[PDB]
Amino acid sequence: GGKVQIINKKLDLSNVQSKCGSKDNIKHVPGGGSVQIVYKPVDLSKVTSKCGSLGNIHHKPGGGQVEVKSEKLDFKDRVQSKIGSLDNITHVPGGGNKKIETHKLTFREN
Amino acid sequence: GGKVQIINKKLDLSNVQSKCGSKDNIKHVPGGGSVQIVYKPVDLSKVTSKCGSLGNIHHKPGGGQVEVKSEKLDFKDRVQSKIGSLDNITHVPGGGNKKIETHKLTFREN
Amino acid sequence: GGKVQIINKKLDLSNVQSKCGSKDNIKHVPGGGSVQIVYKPVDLSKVTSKCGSLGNIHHKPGGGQVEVKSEKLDFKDRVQSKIGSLDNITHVPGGGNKKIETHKLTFREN
Amino acid sequence: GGKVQIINKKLDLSNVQSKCGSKDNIKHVPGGGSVQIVYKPVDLSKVTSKCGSLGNIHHKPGGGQVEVKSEKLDFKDRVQSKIGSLDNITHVPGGGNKKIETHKLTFREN
Amino acid sequence: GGKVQIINKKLDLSNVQSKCGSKDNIKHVPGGGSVQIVYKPVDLSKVTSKCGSLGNIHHKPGGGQVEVKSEKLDFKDRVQSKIGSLDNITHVPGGGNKKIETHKLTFREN
């Protein structure tokens, strides 16, 4: 067989993780007078820290699925839309002091 | 067989995790006069810290599923929409001091 | 067989991770009076730090799937749209002091 | 067999990761009065730091899939659109003080 | 067999990664009154730092797939569009003080 021997003496291990992976000041504003909106944002962000680790120690790991990590994401969408007639009309006849704002988006970071 | 021998003496292990993975100041505002909105944001953010760990120690791990981690997400959507007629009308006749704002979005970070 | 022998003495291991992988000031604004919007942004950002690690120690790892990491993302979309007639009309007859703004987007970083 | 022997004495390992992989000030604004928008931006940015690591130590790793890492992304889209008639009309008859702005985008970095 | 022997004594390893791989001030603005937009930007930017590492130590790694890393991205799109008639008309008859701006984009970096 296979002997595995590990000797540790007077070691000093330190792992510090600070302010990692935080989410601050996020705004989700879908809409705006649309018809169909499928809103599925997906986050898989991994922030990993490690210090002085070690893996698995197996002897003859054979047969089937051993130490298998499987991840499956299914996001198959089917979106259908039937519209007889769609009109976006801005009808401003006559005369005066008129100011019409439609779908106006403003971003001021400052 | 396979002998596994581990000796530890006078070790010092330290793992510090501070302010990791927090969620602050998140706003979800879907809508806006739409028709169909499927709002499924998905978060899988992993913030892991470790220090001086060790894996599994198995002898002949064979047969079937052994130490198998499986993750499956099913987000299959089926969205259907039937509209005979859709009108977005801004009709401003006559004359005066008129100010019409429709679907106006403002972001001031300052 | 295969002997694996490891001797560690008077080591000093340090892993520091600070302010890594954070998400700040993100704005999602889909819409704007559209018809079909499939909004699926996907994030797989990995920020990894390590110090003094070691892998797996296996003896004759043979048969099936051993130490297999599998990731599968399925984002197959099927978007259909049927419109009899789509009109975007800006009809401004007559005479006065008229200011019409449609789909105006402003970004001021400052 | 194959003997693997490792001796470490009076080592000093340090791995520092600071402000890596952060996402700040991102704006997603799809729309603008379109018909079909498939919005699937994909991020796979890997920011890795390491110091004094070591790989796997296997003896006769043969048979099937051993230490196999597999990643599969499926983003096959099928977008269909049928429009009988699409008109974008800016009809400004008559006479006055008229200012019409359509799909105006402004970026001021300053 | 093949003996692998490694002796380390009084080493000093340091790996510093600072402000690497960050994403700041990104704006995604698709749309503008189009018909079909498939918006799939893909990021695979890898920013790696390492110091004093070592690979795998295998003895007779033969059979099947051993230490195989596989990455597959499938972004096959199928976009179809049928339009009976598409008109972009700017009809400005009569007489006055008229200023019409359509699809005007301005970038001021300053």
Major sheet attributes of chain A: none
Radius of gyration of chain A: 29 Å
In quaternary terms, these chains amount to: homopentamer
Helix content of chain A: under 10%
Structural class of chain A: mainly beta
Which overall shape of chain A is indicated by the principal axes computed on the Cα atoms? Answer: elongated
Quote the distance from N terminus to C terminus of chain A: 68 Å
Number of helices of chain A: 0
Give the percentage of residues in beta strands of chain A.
over 45%
Largest interface: A-B, 110 and 110 residues
How many DSSP-defined strands of chain A?
12
Q: What is the H/E string of chain A?
A: EEEEEEEEEEEE
Disulfide bonds (chains A, B, C, D, E): 20-51
Subcellular location (chains A, B, C, D, E): Cytoplasm, Cytosol; Cell membrane; Cytoplasm, Cytoskeleton; Cell projection, Axon
Modified residues (Phosphoserine) (chains A, B, C, D, E): 14, 22, 34, 53, 81, 85
Modified residues (Deamidated asparagine) (chains A, B, C, D, E): 8
What distinguishing features does this structure have?
homopentamer; mainly beta; elongated; protein fibril
SSE order and pairing:
The structure is a homopentamer of 110-residue chains.
Chain A: E1 4-9, E2 13-18, E3 23-28, E4 36-39, E5 42-43, E6 46-49, E7 65-66, E8 69-74, E9 77-83, E10 86-91, E11 97-102, E12 105-108
